[PDB]
Design a protein around this nucleic acid. Structure first.
Length: 641
DNA sequence: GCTGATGCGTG
DNA sequence: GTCGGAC
DNA sequence: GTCCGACAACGCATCAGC
């Protein structure tokens, strides 16, 4: 019985401790009870084992339902390159919850804000939907199919059609199913388990309970014959095989069929890196300064590169001539860059048949022959058929080569990948350029190069080793690079007034999760909202922010507080607290009124990546950073005149 | 035909 | 994107 | 360090309401 399913018990038997018969569809309550056991605990090992127990039962009893259960665990709809999106957020969901309970929409919205969780609202509310006959229980594949049905709905009256499907799921929910149906649509499962733990649990499940066995399975626990130490290293090796394959082919529609037909040990023999299938890109860890860089990379030659402020572009050229371009998150952006497709013959040598390039697409002004800010790049359309219609040109800055002429370079050091990149590809100014580099170990040279990058309209420097641990194997370390930005360094900020608070969600439920900040306009003697603040404080600081600021809650805002298009705070705060806030950039804002009219007639100024530093107990709202000072900091930037 | 609200997605 | 928590 | 989920600004695209 799925109501009593406990995948966290000791000595879990994949066949007898499951809550469904062989060949039957996996009930969605089995996935929900698994979610309950996973979110209760905080150790990833315990969460992996709990999920692994569910997956073993799916492997042994209902193999066809392995894919939907995995996607439900990841809260995804399919492969990232397929570009499926629900089209449902908190807006559609709370409306579906309201129509299914007869409550006012504003009441359901207010309760979801107080509890910081929409699933709790969908669970503690009473249904007003009446059915002549009881509905069949939800299944894992059925619930997954309805999710994809929602994502396929487009056109006029499609919103109401989405809500009907959501109402149909709610009317069939049992126990904790409504809570997790709502969380999945809201995109906040609050599990504590994501992609890495799902992969770890998958490899552990197919290793302990091998797929493809005739029922009843003879091998239900392949680790019982091994010592704890032997069991540990074996599962770790098997986990790396799956993780290394998934990083090169993040497509469960491809891995799972191969996994079920040929096992995990033979998986790299079928799923291999190849152009046309996006791969997980290499990421970077922050570094607080140059001294920290020489410590993390001490005793290893490294290179320094400009960190261009654009969008990543993973360019696949296939055997035959087909070109595809993928974002960092494996989204297919080929239709977005017809200008890049036309550029491919100009950048490669005649001996180049196929490749996978790692580049940064940057908005480029061909009149001034200079780099344009990130905001200009985002103004490009999402579908451009004719390249002549393109208004914002882009210049590609290449910095890595992952695949070349039928051969993978994942296991090659950076020094050789960079060697192959610069030998086999041709530069064209303003179109396709190699990233500005510097190979050195001196502190002063790196400091000058960092300052030269900021002057050249870049975020700072990327630091990458050349030979030691310098491969492109994300499964070994996905953040193998270092990023050194100007705003990372101590002493290289604004003092803003807290004018509002926002109820927190998930880990912030029950307290404040965000705050509305404001600068002081000297000319009008008003506080102008500049940005929201939601990170930088510790749990201890935020709990004390919740206790003291609750004493400054107002029914109505002060007449001298201006927020314009900003989100109205759940709790208006009497202006008193002043916080020191750091940001990466100042942007011209479409909503915030801070410093409006001082640099632009219509738009005020906001803060890119704002972060809480410390409380400014010495200053009152009258002494906060002025709006005029905000305008000065904005014009001081490179790309702003 | 226009527009604000909502969703998606990039940093 | 930044950040801190739990491990 | 790793993995995770809190939270930020701001752009295009879609759809309902007008």
């Amino acid at each position: 019985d799925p109501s009593g399913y406990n995948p966290a018990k000791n000595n879990y038997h994949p066949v007898e401790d499951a809550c469904w018969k062989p060949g039957q569809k996996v009930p969605y309550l089995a996935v929900a009870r698994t979610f309950e056991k996973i979110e209760e605990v905080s150790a990833r090992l315990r969460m992996v084992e709990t999920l692994s127990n569910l997956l073993r039962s799916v492997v042994a009893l209902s193999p066809p339902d392995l894919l939907p259960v995995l996607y439900l665990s990841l809260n995804h709809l399919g492969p990232p390159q397929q570009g499926l999106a629900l089209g449902v957020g908190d807006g559609v969901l709370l409306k579906a919850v309201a129509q299914a309970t007869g409550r006012q929409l504003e009441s359901v919205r207010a309760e979801a804000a107080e509890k910081g969780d929409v699933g709790l609202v969908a669970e503690n509310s009473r249904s007003t939907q009446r059915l002549m006959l009881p509905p069949p229980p939800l299944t894992a594949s059925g619930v997954f199919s309805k999710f994809r049905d929602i994502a396929r709905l487009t056109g006029s009256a499609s919103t109401a059609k989405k809500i009907d499907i959501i109402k149909g799921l709610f009317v069939a929910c049992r126990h904790s199913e409504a809570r997790f149906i709502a969380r999945s649509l809201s995109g906040r499962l609050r599990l504590g388990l994501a992609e890495q733990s799902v992969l770890a649990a998958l490899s552990q499940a197919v290793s302990l309970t091998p797929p493809g066995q005739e029922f009843p399975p003879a091998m239900v626990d392949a680790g019982k014959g091994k010592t704890a130490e032997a069991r540990k290293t074996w599962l770790e090796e098997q986990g790396m095989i799956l993780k290394q394959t998934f990083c090169e082919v993040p497509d469960l529609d491809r891995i799972i069929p191969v996994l079920l037909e040929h096992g995990l040990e033979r998986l790299p023999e079928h799923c291999k890196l190849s152009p046309g299938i996006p791969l997980k890109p290499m990421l970077a860890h922050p570094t607080r300064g140059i001294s920290e860089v020489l410590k993390r990379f001490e005793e290893a030659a490294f290179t320094c590169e400009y960190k261009y402020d654009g969008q990543r572009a993973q360019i696949h050229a296939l055997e035959g001539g087909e070109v595809k371009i993928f974002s960092r998150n494996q989204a297919d952006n080929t239709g977005k860059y017809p200008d890049i497709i036309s550029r491919i013959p100009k950048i490669k040598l005649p001996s180049v048949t196929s490749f996978i390039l790692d580049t940064e697409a940057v908005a480029w002004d061909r009149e001034k022959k200079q780099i344009q800010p990130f905001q200009v790049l985002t103004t490009r359309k999402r579908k451009e058929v004719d390249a002549s219609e393109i208004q914002v040109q882009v210049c590609l800055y290449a910095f890595d080569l992952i695949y070349l002429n039928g051969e993978s370079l994942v296991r090659e050091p950076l020094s050789r990948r960079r060697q192959l990149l610069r030998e086999n590809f041709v530069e064209t100014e303003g179109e396709f350029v190699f990233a500005t580099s510097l190979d050195t170990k001196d502190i002063e040279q790196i400091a000058e190069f960092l300052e030269q990058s900021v002057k050249d309209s870049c975020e700072g420097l990327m630091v990458k080793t050349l030979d030691v641990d310098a491969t492109y194997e994300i499964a070994k370390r996905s953040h193998n690079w270092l990023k050194l930005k100007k705003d990372y360094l101590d002493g290289v900020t604004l003092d803003l007034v807290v004018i509002g608070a926002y109820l927190g969600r998930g880990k912030r439920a029950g307290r404040y999760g965000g705050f509305l900040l404001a600068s002081y306009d000297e000319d009008s003697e008003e506080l102008q909202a500049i940005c929201k603040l939601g990170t930088g404080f510790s749990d201890e600081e935020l709990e004390e922010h919740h206790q003291s600021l609750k004493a400054l809650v107002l029914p109505s805002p002060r007449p001298y507080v201006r927020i314009d298009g900003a989100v109205i705070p759940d709790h208006w705060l009497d202006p008193s607290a002043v916080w020191e806030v750091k940001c990466a950039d100042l942007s011209l804002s479409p909503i915030y009124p801070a410093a409006r009219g001082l640099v632009d007639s219509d738009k005020g100024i906001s803060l890119r990546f704002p972060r809480f530093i410390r409380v400014r107990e010495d200053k009152q709202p009258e002494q906060a950073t002025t709006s005029a000072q905000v305008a000065c900091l904005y014009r001081k930037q490179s790309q702003i005149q």
